[PDB]
Amino acid sequence: PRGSHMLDKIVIANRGEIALRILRACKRLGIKTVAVHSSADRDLKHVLLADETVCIGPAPSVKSYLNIPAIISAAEITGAVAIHPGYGFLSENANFAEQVERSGFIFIGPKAETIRLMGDKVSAIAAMKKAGVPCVPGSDGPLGDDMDKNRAIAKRIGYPVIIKASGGGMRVVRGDAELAQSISMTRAEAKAAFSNDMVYMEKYLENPRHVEIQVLADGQGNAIYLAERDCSMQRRHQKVVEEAPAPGITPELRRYIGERCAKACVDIGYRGAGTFEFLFENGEFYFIEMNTRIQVEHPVTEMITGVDLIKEQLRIAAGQPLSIKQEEVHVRGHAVECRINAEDPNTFLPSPGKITRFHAPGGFGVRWESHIYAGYTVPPYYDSMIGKLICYGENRDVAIARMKNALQELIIDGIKTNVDLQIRIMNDENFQHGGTNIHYLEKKLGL
């Protein structure tokens, strides 16, 4: 008897900690699960737990996890009625979403168009300006040689400003007195750089913070924002720590930025979960991008607000308008997340191999999200992330206090881990204070 709850069976088109995370949501709602794997992830936790499994190609992701037709066929042969992309991989690949629906399957996620829309870095900027989402003030197109208006623009943006090459990989100006020469000095550097003279300008965010807002939208006119997170602790581009709610955000400001994202979702016709990423400097938000999918650090939200986001995606993809409304969403306590990498906390590059001994942390407020275990062999291919350690507190202090101690309990031998590092971040006098910038980590370390 098919559908004693619509989406009977689901392909989890992903791997690692997210796959397992999703599986756990399905199993607990009585959805049969169908895990798609490769022969590197033959012995993954989520795979050993699934109701069915299917091998879809060799180790490399391009041949396995990026294999659109290999996934759809798996859906096809198991009587699956829906596919969960997770994050990264095809989650924001519009072509993939299309072929799944085209192939008669529900894609737990947004429409193929909205993925393109928010994937085109200009389309998204456009659509956000219209929706009224605050963005980086800019010249809105290249700079003339009319030094009257290049001054007119800078003044309208508020110094400092940054001159930027269009085919480049850039100069800060702290006032009128140095604008003409600088525009010029940037031209020179650009002329040589990629053969292009052309440059533009936009406001300079000197010490900004990465703040991001999690939304849900049913496609049917309803969208709620679920607080926000602070993700400023970053190594190269990689997010290292993620707290929520973001310290020193007055509810007046939270309510402000959230409501805007909500509207934007409605205006853009959003469907599913997704994240709005901003810079935040001097009490102002500047939109960087929206990740069209579920977010990695989604759990910190979970902890504070209660709500099951994975559980809520399923509910929308079934075609039900959001069970929740903002007036019900509530921030309670604090939550901090530390990413765990099969890495070396010095020469920062993956450290695959067998985990000879593993012990996970426990107790009140500690949550561990991981597909690893004693005996597990982290492969060389896929991403370096092996777990997420999320600690919950009644406040930021008690949370930070828990994590510091969860991290010691944690045991992973046989590979190097970023734990020694996570311990010295949680043990940072300033991180304790709160409010540190998107540069603070690289300054504490090398780079």
CATH of the domain at 338: 3.30.470.20
Is 1 part of any domain? no
Is 254 part of any domain? yes
Cβ neighbours for 407, distance < 8 A, ≥ 6 positions apart: 338, 361, 389, 419, 422, 423, 426
- Asked if residue 258 and residue 130 are part of one domain, the reply reads yes
Burial class (CB in 10 A: 0-12, 13-18, 19+), 312: buried
Q: Where are the alpha helices (DSSP H) in 135-250?
A: 147-157, 179-194
Q: What's the resolution in A?
A: 2.8
Is 235 part of any domain? yes
Catalytic, out of 15, 293, 367, 396: 293
Closest by CA to 35, choosing from 27, 47, 48, is: 47
- Asked if residue 166 and residue 129 are part of one domain, the reply reads no
Q: Is 121 annotated as a binding residue?
A: yes
Task: Enumerate the β-bridge partners of residue 35.
Answer: 12, 53
Contact 129/138 with Cβ under 8 angstroms? no
- DSSP code for 212: E
Last residue of a domain, one of 177, 204, 231: 204
Q: Is 98 annotated as a binding residue?
A: no
Q: Is 155 annotated as a binding residue?
A: no
Number of compact structural domains in the chain: 3
For the packed helices 121-131 and 251-268, what is the interaxial angle rounded to 10 degrees? 110
Give the torsion sign (CA, 76, 77, 82, 83).
Answer: negative
Rounded CA-CA distance 91/71 in Å is 13
Q: Is 215 annotated as a binding residue?
A: no
- Asked if residue 345 and residue 307 are part of one domain, the reply reads yes
Q: Is 130 annotated as a binding residue?
A: no
Rounded CA-CA distance 351/343 in Å is 5
- Asked if residue 239 and residue 103 are part of one domain, the reply reads yes
Rg of the chain (C-alpha set): 23
Q: State the pairing for strand pair 199-203/161-165.
A: antiparallel
Experimental determination technique: X-ray
Rounded CA-CA distance 107/98 in Å is 9
User: Residue 146 belongs to a domain with what CATH number?
Assistant: 3.30.1490.20
- Asked if residue 112 and residue 149 are part of one domain, the reply reads no
Rounded CA-CA distance 41/60 in Å is 11
Rounded CA-CA distance 19/385 in Å is 13
Buried b (16+ CB within 10 A) or exposed e, 362-385: eeebbbbbbbbeeebebbebbebb
Rounded CA-CA distance 14/71 in Å is 10
- Asked if residue 171 and residue 281 are part of one domain, the reply reads no
Q: Is 237 annotated as a binding residue?
A: yes
Reading the block at residue 78, the tokens are 């198991």
- Asked if residue 179 and residue 68 are part of one domain, the reply reads no
Last residue of a domain, one of 53, 70, 90: 90
Q: Identify the helix (H) or strand (E) that includes residue 116.
A: helix 112-117
Task: Enumerate the β-bridge partners of residue 417.
Answer: 342
Closest by CA to 287, choosing from 276, 271, 302, 275, is: 276
Is 221 part of any domain? yes
Residue 87, number of CB atoms within 10 A of its CB: 16
160 upstream amide cis, omega within 30 of 0: yes
3-state secondary structure of 302: helix
What's the N-to-C CA distance of the chain in angstroms?
A: 60
Closest by CA to 369, choosing from 352, 395, 392, 398, is: 392
Last residue of a domain, one of 63, 90, 117: 90
208 upstream amide cis, omega within 30 of 0: no
User: Residue 14 belongs to a domain with what CATH number?
Assistant: 3.40.50.20
**Structural domain boundaries, residue 141:** 136-204
Is 40 part of any domain? yes
Reading the block at residue 38, the tokens are 């490769």
Is 219 part of any domain? yes
Burial class (CB in 10 A: 0-12, 13-18, 19+), 267: middle
Is 293 an annotated catalytic residue?
A: yes
User: Could you tell me the CA-to-CA distances from 55 to 24, 42, 70, 199 in Å, in that order?
Assistant: 20, 8, 9, 49
- Asked if residue 335 and residue 250 are part of one domain, the reply reads yes
- Asked if residue 400 and residue 274 are part of one domain, the reply reads yes
- Asked if residue 337 and residue 413 are part of one domain, the reply reads yes
CA dihedral 315, 318, 320, 323 (to 10 degrees): 0
Rounded CA-CA distance 114/271 in Å is 9
- Asked if residue 231 and residue 169 are part of one domain, the reply reads no
- Asked if residue 394 and residue 285 are part of one domain, the reply reads yes
